[PDB]
Amino acid sequence: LPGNYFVNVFVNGRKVDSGNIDFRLEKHNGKELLWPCLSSLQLTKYGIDIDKYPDLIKSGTEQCVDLLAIPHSDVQFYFNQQKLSLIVPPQALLPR
Numbered sequence: 001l002p003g004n005y006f007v008n009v010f011v012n013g014r015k016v017d018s019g020n021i022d023f024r025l026e027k028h029n030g031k032e033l034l035w036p037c038l039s040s041l042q043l044t045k046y047g048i049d050i051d052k053y054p055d056l057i058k059s060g061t062e063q064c065v066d067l068l069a070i071p072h073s074d075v076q077f078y079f080n081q082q083k084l085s086l087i088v089p090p091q092a093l094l095p096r
Contacts, residue, residue: 002034007077007084009046012093016046021084023077028068034077036084037064046086049094 002024009017021042026035040050040062050056053070060066067075067086074087 005079005082007082010083010085011046011048012087012090034079035067036075036077038067039063040065044094047094047096048086048088048092052092
């Protein structure tokens with residue numbers, strides 16, 4: 001069900017945060033899924049270089065970025081494990 005869930009966030013196999021994220025229904029090519037609203041600040045927090053993909057904001061907003069703008073990426077919410085997993089290419093990561 002849509003709403004706020006306390007989740008562990010992982011980027012490229014690394015746990016980078018734990019907290020409440022709002023998930024809403026989003027229809028992608030005839031399939032409904034729960035999709036996270038992530039801010040440009042939250043993406044930065046998770047180690048993603050938002051400046052290399054300006055379309056995160058331009059095709060979305062700063063409050064809720066367009067995650068489909070990062071090429072060759074996968075976003076998966078594992079509801080039972082309370083786990084949000086983001087897979088991004090190595091070049092999407094910050095110098096950290």
